[PDB]
Design a protein around this ligand. Structure first.
Ligand code: A1BNM
Lengths: 117, 199, 286, 183
């Protein structure tokens, strides 16, 4: 199982970005995290298999995370981006290697997002 | 590929010629560098907004208004395939009126002569800007490869420079010659100034 | 001759390995209180049945050398009775284990309440009584026959009706019903595992539950693989009256030998499919 | 976030030295620890990080990590004397960096002085600079705290001069050496 992230690029302030995370026994949870050079990681989103979402205080009103269980792919729609949202966003997924295996977490490689041009 | 800039406080443009985004650092003398501008346009946390970075291909760090605290070396740290390459570094210095160096040549001391070494010091005191040229002529013949130069930092009071060129030679060589001098060339000087003494 | 002594040597090796492994399993189960979970009690019962079914192997293998039964009619009674006790004990133990796994998984709220080890011992006793309900007639109706050639140990019935009734009762109440119960329980355990993120909440506890359920399923499948040939062969040989032949005799010998070999095969499965069992098998043996 | 550097000392040419600085206040897995060298009177140079790369210092250098990153130097040369800094970075900064992104070494330490010298402490030599406002001073050679006024930065011979435009006192702490100027 490998976690692939994409959709990160240079975007002028106020633009929109479609983040993506792909995982190849059953994927129950999938999350996102942001990290700045002078700041610790802050949770931005959290979604379950059912589809319930939890957001950060500053993230709320601009971030939409939804799960496509058929393709086991999550994506994050990025709206009203500001320069303060320049960081490397990480995709974290929790799954099971096998039906008889234990619950295991997986960290994505991270995608860099910079809002400036 | 960024070497020395002179600008007064409150004057507005560094360049780091190259395709990875560059990062800009500041280091005061005898200190550790601090990060100012990353991702080629993004400011560090807790940094005054005067510093601003831009990319065509010659990335540039520009300061809106200089301050006495912002007087240091700027290092552009550009990434590559597998190795980041720091820039040579640019230094901003206080602008000041051109000053004329005061050249004093020091004959070797009797104690040092008794020890067995001869040292001649050509001292430039309270001169601006940093750039200078010092030449040694012994018996009307130019000498090279036997001198060392030390450049002081800008003085807090006068914002000038003091430079010394030290000529070290063996006692027998010194006794061989009798005419010793050092030639100083500077922009303020209309003609080179030479100070001479007799052994 | 050579084939006969080779078969006798194979039977002796299987017998000694079976007693050794099953006694070791029983000892490591009874050694510690941490080895007293609900699953371990049924593993104890299965190992007990295997040990009982293996202790009679040397008597059964000696007869191949002379075709006579000098041990005695009481020993013939005990051997024939244990031969029928083993199937019922082991299969009902497996069915109880598989239903216990379902109680643990799909109903965790009442699982800890209803899977008390005393309850599990009560179910083991019920297994023993249910096995007795079809084993005791074999105990009473088994006796030696003083044939002209040599004394042999065979079953007796009052006979074409009761002899087939016993086989039908074994095949119905001891193979099909327990296999169906195990399949029914596991077909819902699998779905409850798939559709639920965390069973016991604790990741370590959930992993232990899934691993022990995998081990139970593997043991059940091993027993099924080992015991389908003999049950089906016994049913078919009576159904279509297969005549004597070299291939038929070889198949009969192989079926009996593999059904007995399952007893020694079980300790290998426990060692290879459980960390605690593997650690115990090395700590006590050293 | 604190990064403190240690392990540097006086070395002889061709020797070996091992430097490690501790990373505290943050997770170590999701980051990398870099080593940045600064020669005395020279700019910043990056040598390696701690997925490993070396500056084209390749072969002679060794870096390894386990809350500490260990930098081992083999076949030290004369030019290898410098000031060494260790700075924090992203884990996969090689992947992260692109035409539009650059993580940058956000946090830095204090610097550990590594000096390679095939010589021991030498007694400072002082000479009075006789005045030929007349300038006079004291010169220190072949060795420094000088007290009496301009004092020049130390120079390395293959030597510092103090001039005051009166008794000069020159003190060398390693040698405990303690030593008037008139026309
Ligand atoms: C020389 C050894 N030997 C043993 C036998 C006969 N045994 C074998 C087969 C059986 C059986 C199985 C299913 C249905 C059924 O009606 C009977 C016994 C009950 C148990 C023996 C066995 O295989 O399980 C350990 C018994 C009649 C003949 N020869």
């Amino acid at each position: 199982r490998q976690l692939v992230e994409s959709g990160g690029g240079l975007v002028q302030p106020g633009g929109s970005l479609r983040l993506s995370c792909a995982a190849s026994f059953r994927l129950y949870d999938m999350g996102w995290f942001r990290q700045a050079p002078g700041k610790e990681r802050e949770g931005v989103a959290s979604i379950t298999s059912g589809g319930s979402t939890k957001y950060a205080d500053s993230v709320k009103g601009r971030f939409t995370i939804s799960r496509d269980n058929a393709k086991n792919t999550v994506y994050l729609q990025m709206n009203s981006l500001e320069p303060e949202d320049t960081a490397v966003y990480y995709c974290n997924a929790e799954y099971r290697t096998g039906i008889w295996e234990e619950l295991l977490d997986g960290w994505g490689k991270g995608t860099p997002v910079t809002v400036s041009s | 590929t960024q070497s020395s800039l002179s600008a007064s406080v409150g004057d507005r443009t560094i360049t780091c010629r190259a395709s990875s985004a560059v990062a800009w650092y500041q280091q005061k003398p005898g200190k550790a560098p601090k990060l100012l501008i990353y991702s080629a346009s993004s400011l560090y946390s807790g940094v005054p907004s005067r510093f601003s970075g831009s990319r065509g291909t010659d990335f540039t760090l520009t300061i809106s208004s200089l301050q006495p605290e912002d007087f240091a070396t700027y290092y552009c740290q550009q990434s590559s395939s597998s190795l980041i390459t720091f820039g040579q570094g640019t230094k901003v210095e206080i602008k000041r009126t051109v000053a004329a160096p005061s050249v004093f040549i020091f004959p070797p001391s009797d104690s040092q002569l008794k020890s067995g070494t001869a040292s001649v010091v050509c001292l430039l005191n309270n001169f601006y800007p940093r750039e200078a040229k010092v030449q040694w002529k012994v018996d009307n013949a130019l000498q090279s490869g036997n001198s060392q130069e030390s450049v002081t930092e800008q003085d807090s009071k006068d914002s000038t420079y003091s430079l010394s060129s030290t000529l070290t030679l063996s006692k027998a060589d010194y006794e061989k010659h009798k005419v010793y001098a050092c030639e100083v060339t500077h922009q303020g000087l209309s003609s080179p100034v030479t100070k001479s003494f007799n052994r | 001759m050579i084939t006969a002594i080779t078969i006798m040597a194979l039977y002796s090796i299987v017998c000694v390995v079976g007693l050794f492994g099953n006694f070791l399993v029983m000892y490591v189960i009874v050694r510690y209180t941490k080895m007293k979970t609900a699953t371990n009690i049924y593993i104890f019962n299965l190992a007990l049945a295997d040990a009982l079914a293996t202790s009679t192997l040397p008597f059964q293998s000696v007869n191949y050398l002379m075709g006579t039964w000098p041990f005695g009619t009481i020993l013939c009674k005990i051997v024939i009775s244990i031969d029928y006790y083993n199937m019922f004990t082991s299969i009902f133990t497996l069915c109880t284990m598989s239903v216990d796994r379902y109680i643990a998984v799909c109903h965790p709220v009442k699982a800890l309440d209803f899977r008390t080890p005393r309850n599990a011992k009560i179910i083991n006793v019920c297994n023993w009584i249910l096995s007795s309900a079809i084993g005791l007639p074999v105990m009473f109706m088994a006796t030696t026959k003083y044939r002209q050639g040599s004394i042999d140990c065979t079953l007796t019935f009052s006979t074409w009706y009761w002899e087939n009734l016993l086989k039908i009762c074994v095949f119905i109440f001891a193979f099909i019903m327990p296999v169906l119960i195990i399949t029914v329980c596991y077909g819902l355990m699998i779905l409850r595992l798939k559709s639920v993120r965390l069973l016991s909440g604790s990741r370590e506890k959930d992993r232990n539950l899934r691993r022990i359920t995998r081990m139970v399923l593997v043991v059940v499948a091993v027993f099924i693989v080992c015991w389908t040939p003999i049950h089906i062969y016994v049913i078919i040989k009576a159904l279509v009256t297969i005549p004597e032949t070299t291939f038929q005799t070889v198949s009969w010998h192989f079926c009996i030998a593999l059904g007995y070999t399952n007893s020694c095969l079980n300790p290998v499965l426990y060692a290879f499919l459980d960390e605690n069992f593997k650690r115990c098998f090395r700590e006590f043996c050293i | 976030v604190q990064l403190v550097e240690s392990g540097g000392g006086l070395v002889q040419p061709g020797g070996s030295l091992r430097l490690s600085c501790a990373a505290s206040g943050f997770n170590f897995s999701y980051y990398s620890i870099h080593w940045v060298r600064q020669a005395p009177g020279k700019g910043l140079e990056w040598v390696a990080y701690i997925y490993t790369s070396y500056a084209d210092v390749k072969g002679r250098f060794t870096i390894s990590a386990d809350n500490t990153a260990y930098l081992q130097m083999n076949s030290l040369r004369a030019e290898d004397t410098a000031v060494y800094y260790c700075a924090r970075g992203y884990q996969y900064w090689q992947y992260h960096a692109s035409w539009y992104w650059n993580g940058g070494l956000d946090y830095w330490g204090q610097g550990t002085l590594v000096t390679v010298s095939s010589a021991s402490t030498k007694g400072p030599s002082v000479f009075p600079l006789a005045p030929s406002t007349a300038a006079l001073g004291c010169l220190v050679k072949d060795y420094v705290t000088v007290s009496w006024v301009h004092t020049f930065p130390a120079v390395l011979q293959s030597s510092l001069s103090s001039v005051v435009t009166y008794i000069c006192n020159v003190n060398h702490k390693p040698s405990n050496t303690k030593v008037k100027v008139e026309p």
